[PDB]
């Protein structure tokens, strides 16, 4: 990396800044074997995979990428439809990045926003994927269809971060550290920062400290309220299901299971899906790294 | 801060929960006016003088708002529940010898007002609610579209200190943005700049912001539960009522307001007025005219 103060949490992994038509994608790359792309979510960066990626690199060529606009990836300028931060566009961008590495058919695991990229990739371009894992999510459509008083109060940030700019940007800009740290803690099982490595927390904090990075996060959530929802609605209403073998993992105290039975939801969206809970909040790869690594290795190796 | 109420006096009214500030003017039958968020009693300045042609007009700051005192809240947000606020205002009115009065409210003050009417109908001769539906009805309509439109119902209701921390960064931005965004114009041009300054100065105080978040927490929890009991009981307000709303406001966004109010009140009339959510400032003549006609009657 180019930031002198931040830890290297993937000892021995290389790196890559991969050009695409929407901007560079930063990734750490390690291991050997079949290619496996790992995609983080909010308010994190690729480093969230640091306690799973080395175990996966014993079996796979692991590509640990910052999402478009996140971490050290470039931040394309957005537009009125939030286009570069839609899951459709991110998926296209990451497909281009993987081609740069010679990977036209690969395995994919995503967490949170990255899981949203991942299932959208599978809907739009299933030929790209051998197998898919989604961690800690339901489809975006399913979150919004669950909207009611209880869900609006229990899971407020979808609507808040989606408000027109500059509302969330101004609110987040006064004390960004307090907001990101409280979010990271709130969504864990225990409600504190103990599940995270402090060095990883520093990566998350430093990213969140940049106004441009916060803007991207809000654009991601705007897309999540608008285009992403629309795209998902088209698929569900058409009865399109992902044909790619799929794994759904979620924390037992996470967001996805708030008011759903996640495997039943996924079966509506995918024709060959398996899945299981793990005792954890919303940050499976950090909260439950050994169980998450095992479940992924077993799924992708089968 | 400017005086926007020619002919009105300034009163601190004692209650068991603290002082209520009011401007008081006119003579005749008593009429209480209750503001909402993120405003103070000043919001009535374009309509109150017309009302005071005919009525003794009491323009009060809600409990914890403006210059009223701030009772200490608790884990159930009790002093900022509409039921509690209504009780406190009933006490304040009793200090003036008013036990049967007319009432008009706007936004959170309208919520106080219909709750007052449900709990203590004998206190009211007539009731006007501006720019609202019942709390229960908003929550029953809280789908994706509505969650995006009225996000602040869930944001401000998050457990402390989340909203308070965010709002303290640039409170002037946020208050001004709320004021502007909820108007037809989408800017501050509908407001007297002197009024805007009252609202800005109130919102600049952290303790005042905390009250506003407690108000919204009650709105999410106890107020909802109180309303749900009345809906389950089939209780309707028997007090003659007027519902006015902005054609571009929040109340009409996901519902037909008079249809809704007819489910809650047995004697309701009403009308849209071309305006955003701030009827008394965006559309002062039409609002005053409707109120005078209604309350004279
Ligand atoms: Ca091997
Ligand atoms: Ca309408
Ligand atoms: Cl696109
Ligand atoms: Cl979800
Ligand atoms: Cl584990
Ligand atoms: Cl309101």
UniProtKB/Swiss-Prot annotation, chain A:
It catalyses: a haloacetate + H2O = a halide anion + glycolate + H(+); fluoroacetate + H2O = fluoride + glycolate + H(+); chloroacetate + H2O = glycolate + chloride + H(+). Its EC number is 3.8.1.3. It is an enzyme of class 3 (hydrolase). Changing residue 112 to N: Loss of enzyme activity. Keywords: Hydrolase. It comes from the Bacteria. Pfam families: Abhydrolase_1. Fluoroacetate binds at residues 113, 116, 157-158, 221. The active site is at residues 112, 282. GO terms for molecular function: haloacetate dehalogenase activity. The record marks 136 as: Important for enzyme activity. Residues 34-272 form the AB hydrolase-1 domain. Homodimer. Belongs to the AB hydrolase superfamily. Epoxide hydrolase family. Catalyzes the hydrolytic defluorination of fluoroacetate to produce glycolate. Has lower activity towards chloroacetate and bromoacetate. This is Fluoroacetate dehalogenase. It comes from Rhodopseudomonas palustris (strain ATCC BAA-98 / CGA009).
Curated annotation (Swiss-Prot), chain B:
The active site is at 107 (nucleophile), 277 (proton acceptor). Pfam families: Abhydrolase_1 (PF00561). Changing residue 152 to N: Reduced catalytic rate with fluoroacetate, but increased catalytic rate with chloroacetate. Minor effect on substrate affinity. One of its GO terms (molecular function) is haloacetate dehalogenase activity. Changing residue 182 to F: Reduced catalytic rate. Minor effect on substrate affinity. It is an enzyme of class 3 (hydrolase). Fluoroacetate binds at residues 108, 111, 152-153, 216. It catalyses: a haloacetate + H2O = a halide anion + glycolate + H(+); fluoroacetate + H2O = fluoride + glycolate + H(+); chloroacetate + H2O = glycolate + chloride + H(+). Keywords: Hydrolase. SUPFAM superfamilies: alpha/beta-Hydrolases. The record marks 131 as: Important for enzyme activity. Its EC number is 3.8.1.3. Residues 29-267 form the AB hydrolase-1 domain. Homodimer. Belongs to the AB hydrolase superfamily. Epoxide hydrolase family. PANTHER family: EPOXIDE HYDROLASE. Catalyzes the hydrolytic defluorination of fluoroacetate to produce glycolate. Has lower activity towards chloroacetate and bromoacetate. This is Fluoroacetate dehalogenase.
